[PDB]
Amino acid sequence: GMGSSIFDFEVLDADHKPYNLVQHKGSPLLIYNVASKCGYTKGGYETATTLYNKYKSQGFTVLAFPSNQFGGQEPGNEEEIKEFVCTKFKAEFPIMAKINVNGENAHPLYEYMKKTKPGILATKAIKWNFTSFLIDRDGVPVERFSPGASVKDIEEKLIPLLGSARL
Protein backbone atom coordinates (compact mmCIF):
# COMPACT_ATOMS: atom_id res chain seq x y z
CA GLY A 1 0.00 0.00 0.00
CA MET A 2 2.38 2.67 -1.24
CA GLY A 3 -0.11 5.49 -1.15
CA SER A 4 -3.45 4.16 0.03
CA SER A 5 -5.28 7.43 -0.51
CA ILE A 6 -4.62 10.87 -1.99
CA PHE A 7 -3.62 12.17 1.44
CA ASP A 8 -0.58 9.91 1.42
CA PHE A 9 0.84 12.76 -0.62
CA GLU A 10 1.27 16.38 0.44
CA VAL A 11 -0.21 19.38 -1.36
CA LEU A 12 0.98 22.90 -2.13
CA ASP A 13 -1.49 25.76 -1.75
CA ALA A 14 -1.97 28.40 -4.48
CA ASP A 15 1.36 29.90 -3.41
CA HIS A 16 3.00 26.52 -2.74
CA LYS A 17 2.62 26.98 0.97
CA PRO A 18 1.79 23.58 2.52
CA TYR A 19 -1.86 22.90 1.75
CA ASN A 20 -3.48 20.73 4.41
CA LEU A 21 -5.33 18.52 1.93
CA VAL A 22 -6.02 15.81 4.46
CA GLN A 23 -8.42 17.98 6.46
CA HIS A 24 -10.77 17.32 3.55
CA LYS A 25 -10.62 13.67 4.49
CA GLY A 26 -13.79 12.23 5.94
CA SER A 27 -15.56 14.18 3.25
CA PRO A 28 -15.77 13.60 -0.53
CA LEU A 29 -14.05 16.11 -2.76
CA LEU A 30 -13.23 16.93 -6.36
CA ILE A 31 -9.82 17.94 -7.59
CA TYR A 32 -9.33 19.69 -10.92
CA ASN A 33 -6.10 19.64 -12.91
CA VAL A 34 -7.02 22.98 -14.43
CA ALA A 35 -5.53 25.61 -16.68
CA SER A 36 -5.51 28.41 -14.18
CA LYS A 37 -7.35 31.16 -16.09
CA CYS A 38 -5.77 30.81 -19.53
CA GLY A 39 -7.74 30.64 -22.73
CA TYR A 40 -10.89 28.76 -21.81
CA THR A 41 -12.35 26.02 -19.64
CA LYS A 42 -15.11 23.72 -20.87
CA GLY A 43 -17.24 24.75 -17.90
CA GLY A 44 -14.73 23.84 -15.24
CA TYR A 45 -14.73 26.97 -13.15
CA GLU A 46 -18.52 27.05 -13.00
CA THR A 47 -18.91 23.35 -12.25
CA ALA A 48 -16.15 23.41 -9.65
CA THR A 49 -17.49 26.53 -7.93
CA THR A 50 -21.06 25.22 -8.07
CA LEU A 51 -20.21 21.77 -6.74
CA TYR A 52 -18.26 23.21 -3.82
CA ASN A 53 -21.06 25.54 -2.72
CA LYS A 54 -23.91 23.13 -3.45
CA TYR A 55 -22.48 20.01 -1.85
CA LYS A 56 -20.60 21.67 1.01
CA SER A 57 -23.72 20.79 3.00
CA GLN A 58 -22.89 17.08 2.76
CA GLY A 59 -19.26 17.94 3.37
CA PHE A 60 -17.73 18.40 -0.05
CA THR A 61 -14.72 20.35 -1.20
CA VAL A 62 -13.47 21.21 -4.66
CA LEU A 63 -9.72 21.61 -4.99
CA ALA A 64 -8.46 23.06 -8.24
CA PHE A 65 -4.80 22.51 -8.92
CA PRO A 66 -3.66 24.95 -11.62
CA SER A 67 -1.47 23.80 -14.42
CA ASN A 68 2.18 24.77 -14.63
CA GLN A 69 2.89 25.78 -18.24
CA PHE A 70 6.57 25.35 -17.39
CA GLY A 71 6.27 21.61 -16.87
CA GLY A 72 6.87 20.84 -20.52
CA GLN A 73 3.86 18.71 -21.34
CA GLU A 74 0.94 20.35 -19.54
CA PRO A 75 -2.21 18.56 -20.79
CA GLY A 76 -3.53 19.91 -24.03
CA ASN A 77 -3.18 23.36 -22.58
CA GLU A 78 0.56 23.40 -23.36
CA GLU A 79 -0.24 25.08 -26.68
CA GLU A 80 -2.61 27.43 -24.92
CA ILE A 81 -0.70 28.86 -21.97
CA LYS A 82 2.08 30.00 -24.32
CA GLU A 83 0.52 33.40 -24.77
CA PHE A 84 -1.05 33.29 -21.34
CA VAL A 85 0.10 32.77 -17.79
CA CYS A 86 -1.72 30.36 -15.54
CA THR A 87 -1.60 31.22 -11.89
CA LYS A 88 -4.33 30.28 -9.32
CA PHE A 89 -7.51 31.43 -11.07
CA LYS A 90 -9.04 31.75 -7.58
CA ALA A 91 -12.67 31.07 -6.70
CA GLU A 92 -15.15 30.31 -3.92
CA PHE A 93 -13.36 27.00 -3.56
CA PRO A 94 -9.69 26.10 -2.78
CA ILE A 95 -7.35 26.50 -5.75
CA MET A 96 -3.94 24.90 -5.32
CA ALA A 97 -0.36 24.99 -6.57
CA LYS A 98 -0.01 24.72 -10.35
CA ILE A 99 1.70 21.48 -11.13
CA ASN A 100 2.55 19.79 -14.38
CA VAL A 101 -0.42 17.48 -14.55
CA ASN A 102 1.08 15.13 -17.16
CA GLY A 103 4.23 13.39 -18.17
CA GLU A 104 6.99 12.65 -15.70
CA ASN A 105 6.93 16.07 -14.11
CA ALA A 106 3.53 15.55 -12.52
CA HIS A 107 3.08 16.16 -8.81
CA PRO A 108 3.45 12.73 -7.09
CA LEU A 109 -0.10 13.13 -5.79
CA TYR A 110 -1.33 13.43 -9.38
CA GLU A 111 0.95 10.56 -10.27
CA TYR A 112 -1.20 8.71 -7.74
CA MET A 113 -4.50 10.11 -9.00
CA LYS A 114 -3.68 9.56 -12.67
CA LYS A 115 -2.41 6.00 -12.17
CA THR A 116 -5.39 5.15 -9.99
CA LYS A 117 -8.29 6.23 -12.17
CA PRO A 118 -8.19 6.55 -15.98
CA GLY A 119 -11.81 7.63 -15.68
CA ILE A 120 -14.06 7.71 -18.72
CA LEU A 121 -11.57 8.06 -21.56
CA ALA A 122 -8.70 6.11 -23.10
CA THR A 123 -5.84 5.45 -20.65
CA LYS A 124 -5.10 7.55 -17.59
CA ALA A 125 -3.18 10.57 -18.85
CA ILE A 126 -3.87 14.27 -18.41
CA LYS A 127 -4.41 15.86 -21.86
CA TRP A 128 -7.11 18.50 -21.28
CA ASN A 129 -8.51 21.34 -19.12
CA PHE A 130 -9.77 21.23 -15.55
CA THR A 131 -10.67 17.49 -15.50
CA SER A 132 -11.82 16.79 -11.97
CA PHE A 133 -11.09 13.57 -10.13
CA LEU A 134 -13.88 12.27 -8.02
CA ILE A 135 -12.25 11.79 -4.67
CA ASP A 136 -14.21 9.94 -1.99
CA ARG A 137 -14.35 10.51 1.79
CA ASP A 138 -11.19 8.48 2.16
CA GLY A 139 -9.16 10.01 -0.61
CA VAL A 140 -9.58 7.37 -3.28
CA PRO A 141 -10.22 8.48 -6.88
CA VAL A 142 -13.49 6.85 -7.90
CA GLU A 143 -13.73 8.70 -11.22
CA ARG A 144 -11.96 11.12 -13.54
CA PHE A 145 -14.30 13.59 -15.25
CA SER A 146 -12.46 15.37 -18.06
CA PRO A 147 -13.55 18.91 -19.21
CA GLY A 148 -16.38 17.12 -20.96
CA ALA A 149 -18.42 16.46 -17.85
CA SER A 150 -20.96 18.95 -16.55
CA VAL A 151 -22.40 19.38 -13.03
CA LYS A 152 -24.86 16.49 -13.20
CA ASP A 153 -22.33 14.32 -15.03
CA ILE A 154 -20.35 14.50 -11.82
CA GLU A 155 -23.36 14.36 -9.50
CA GLU A 156 -24.32 10.84 -10.59
CA LYS A 157 -21.00 9.62 -9.21
CA LEU A 158 -20.69 12.14 -6.39
CA ILE A 159 -24.04 12.07 -4.56
CA PRO A 160 -23.60 8.46 -3.24
CA LEU A 161 -20.12 9.33 -1.94
CA LEU A 162 -21.21 12.59 -0.30
CA GLY A 163 -23.67 10.50 1.58
CA SER A 164 -21.12 7.76 2.32
CA ALA A 165 -18.21 6.48 0.21
CA ARG A 166 -17.06 3.73 2.52
CA LEU A 167 -18.37 4.41 6.04
**Domain limits for position 30:** 1-167
33: domain CATH number is 3.40.30.10
What number of helices (H) and strands (E) belong to the chain?
A: 3, 6
Other Cβ atoms less than 10 A from the Cβ of 70: the count is 12
As for how many domains the chain has, the answer is 1
What residues are labeled active site? Answer: 38
| Cα distances (Å, whole numbers) of residue 11 to 85, 105, 106, 152 | 21, 15, 12, 27
CA distance 28 to 59: 7
Half-sphere exposure of 139 (CA within 13 A, CB side): 18
The gap from C-alpha 58 to its chain's centroid, in whole angstroms, comes to 19
CA distance 120 to 44: 17
Method: NMR
The gap from C-alpha 24 to its chain's centroid, in whole angstroms, comes to 13
Instruction: Using alpha carbons, select from 48, 58, 49 the residue that is nearest to residue 28.
Output: 58
Q: Residue 108 belongs to what H/E stretch?
A: helix 108-116
